[PDB]
Design a protein around this ligand. Structure first.
Ligand SMILES: Nc1ncnc2c1ncn2[C@@H]1O[C@H](COP(=O)(O)OP(=O)(O)OP(=O)(O)O)[C@@H](O)[C@H]1O
Ligand SMILES: Nc1ncnc2c1ncn2[C@@H]1O[C@H](COP(=O)(O)OP(=O)(O)OP(=O)(O)O)[C@@H](O)[C@H]1O
Ligand SMILES: Nc1ncnc2c1ncn2[C@@H]1O[C@H](COP(=O)(O)OP(=O)(O)OP(=O)(O)O)[C@@H](O)[C@H]1O
Ligand SMILES: Nc1ncnc2c1ncn2[C@@H]1O[C@H](COP(=O)(O)OP(=O)(O)OP(=O)(O)O)[C@@H](O)[C@H]1O
Ligand code: NA
Ligand code: NA
Lengths: 215, 215, 215, 215
């Protein structure tokens, strides 16, 4: 797999550094000279180029990349023109970072395979942690079911798993308990719940909220 | 709970809209007139103010907010001077959006309770999906254990749960299977695995990668 | 018919002045204060507004206009987001002025009913007059047939229509002859051809060029 | 014929590409480095130069060109100083693209052989098509007579030429009928008029409008 990342910002530069860490061939393209010099050591190849130009895009050998990530999310004109060129060049996978709702609609029309909202998705996840401080990290399996990594309270100290009627009353299944950097995978009844550490739970979205308030 | 969000960007405006959707009192503060007019309907109170000024900050009644989120991640001077004022005003919870590694170190010194990297965290999660297309969304329970929502392949079609020796060989536990918008919570042996839909699994980080390659 | 012209440039301001001359209700929208003040007397209604904003676009009553002309041809971001909003608002006819080939392709994707190249079409017509000074104005009926308003040469002076074997040899039909501000519609054989005045001809594109060189 | 085009914009670059297509020697002059690199392949010779400088203008051998086209229509100072130099250098034909009415008056004073308004002429032609949707393209032979390429309506279907009394009542002559990419030159009575395709007509300006309303 050969990856090309166009636009070395906070979001684009993180993809370059992570893919280079995993041992992947990454082409880092940016119009800024200082950005390319900073990410020259964090990419297989770093080029100072304008992606809105077809002649400069063909000089990179961009047709040899299966995945191209257009991480420009503040210039709609630069973002939409780039993916119009890549779609014309028959790139199998174009992932674009969008800015707002209207930018999302343009990229969907001109054939962007996946459209990403990094700050919008994180802001929704952060606002869930602000509203309820008991949660630490959650993953939405669907619109009604989710896996929530809860934080243990003071009332849950010295409590066994069989004491908590999550399976019967709340209809939720405890998945894993982490104690002081040691994680217990699929605990069996019964285990004593320690102080304020991680507690992974799975259930309906409304059912987990009932467990937090009651227990 | 009263929340104040300072800086209505892509990240800050998403927290305002999500907290207002949940029914929370949100104060939206921005130095830009156009940003405040756009988010006036998505916040309980929207004020055009400079947060680096103590006199303007005290005019907002900012001492009445338990949570203040400083969502300025491109102006380090504006971000660090705001949280210095809020720390001086004894705000119990200050959550700051950082820009790079050096901005993270300054905010840790001047007393930021939680420091957030929205684009850096999403770029790491996106790069995991680029490297392995079988994964869809994952949550890191620890540095060695994670819950990965896999995507079913063609070889897993018409296969039962008991046929897959994930519990014995791979040491991984299947958590939930979603079929065409219908999610089965904690499936029992045995269930037929359908076509390319969601498949939630839990196990060691290295053990899940073995399951993807072999099966 | 109610027309809205967005962008009062050299091209947009000409549509406003011509439609207002014919007695049509024209809404002139521009983001520049000086442009609106200049065209306030040449439009039924002139508003200073940003067309990329949906709230400002709905304040104009833009849903009441059958034809909206987006005459912005130097800002691709402003041009493509305006027509995305108008397409979302179900405007029956959206005519957009494009900048280059790539801007033409974006507007075709997001549903522009007619795309106009004013300078590109005039430059092609002007370059035809530079290459052959005998022509004055031409209209392309098809890719092989055209009506060319020729200019009479010195060798065509004191020549009758029957003397010119355009119908038999060249396969071209003389349409109209203009003499000193007096235009003769469909002349009959034979009429004396005067000095260097207009001479409208119709025929194949290659056949007219043979007539110019030989006669 | 040797042509020089000064200013490679939307209008100037179209003249360069069209004249180069016809097989003419074109000198493309622009002050922008990126414009010259783009049109280097579409011109015989492309030079990065400032046309307001006499020393740079004489380095191009501009005295060897019969036609010079000054396609600068947004900088009046650059446009008027260029044609003052070319008039001083005794260029036989100087064609200048103007911006407004006052720019047209200056160029007429300092000796511009032909002054062109590309957006103003297209805006007038476009506004004629907006006012009456039956017309497609027209050419003004004079102030009272024109050739209009009409669009066939539903009431003109299955109608013969002799049925339409354009020659007797309206005083208009049908010139050519185009059917599905096939163009009939000077049709003879009688031909059946098909569905909504091109229909070229010639007559007085007021007489054609009567034909559209009645038929
Ligand atoms: N036409 C272009 N071609 C290549 N790179 C470009 C182009 N235009 C902008 N860039 C670069 O893309 C990077 C990211 O774009 P920008 O800063 O506008 O977006 P952003 O949404 O604010 O970024 P992020 O949130 O990832 O920090 C910048 O380093 C910028 O220099
Ligand atoms: N001193 C300040 N007080 C209040 N708001 C401010 C101040 N300085 C900047 N802002 C606002 O904060 C918002 C977000 O800041 P900025 O755009 O610099 O950061 P960012 O990291 O690029 O944002 P995001 O990624 O969330 O789009 C902007 O709307 C900006 O106007
Ligand atoms: N978002 C916008 N909303 C409304 N008007 C706008 C907007 N952006 C630009 N305009 C106006 O549109 C007009 C024409 O746009 P612009 O000058 O960028 O294009 P152009 O192709 O150079 O124009 P022209 O060739 O017709 O002179 C200008 O008067 C400009 O102020
Ligand atoms: N002094 C100069 N000498 C040569 N070229 C020039 C000079 N000044 C401007 N130009 C170039 O002339 C070109 C056209 O000029 P400009 O863009 O100002 O006019 P315009 O009327 O907006 O153009 P168009 O409608 O053809 O796009 C531009 O590429 C510009 O760089
Ligand atoms: Na950002
Ligand atoms: Na123009």
């Amino acid at each position: 797999k050969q990856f090309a990342v166009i636009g070395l910002g906070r979001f684009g530069g993180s993809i370059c550094k992570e893919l280079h860490r995993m041992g992947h061939e990454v082409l880092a393209v940016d119009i800024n000279e200082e950005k390319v010099n900073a990410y020259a050591s964090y990419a297989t190849h770093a080029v100072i180029a304008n992606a809105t130009e077809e002649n400069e895009l063909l000089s990179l050998g961009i047709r040899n990349f299966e995945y191209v990530i257009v991480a420009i999310g503040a210039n709609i004109q630069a973002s939409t023109l780039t993916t119009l060129l890549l779609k014309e060049l028959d790139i199998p996978n174009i992932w674009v970072k969008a800015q707002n709702y209207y930018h999302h609609k343009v990229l969907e029309k001109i054939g962007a395979d996946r459209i990403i909202h990094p700050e919008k998705d994180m802001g929704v996840k952060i606002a869930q942690s602000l509203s309820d401080e008991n949660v630490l990290n959650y993953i939405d399996l669907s619109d009604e079911y989710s896996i929530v990594e809860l934080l243990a309270t003071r009332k849950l100290d010295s409590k066994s798993i069989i004491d908590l009627n999550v399976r019967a009353k709340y209809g939720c299944t405890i998945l894993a308990i982490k104690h002081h950097g040691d994680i217990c995978l699929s605990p069996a009844p019964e285990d004593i719940i320690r102080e304020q550490d991680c507690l992974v739970i799975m259930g309906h979205k409304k059912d987990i909220k009932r467990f937090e308030n009651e227990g």
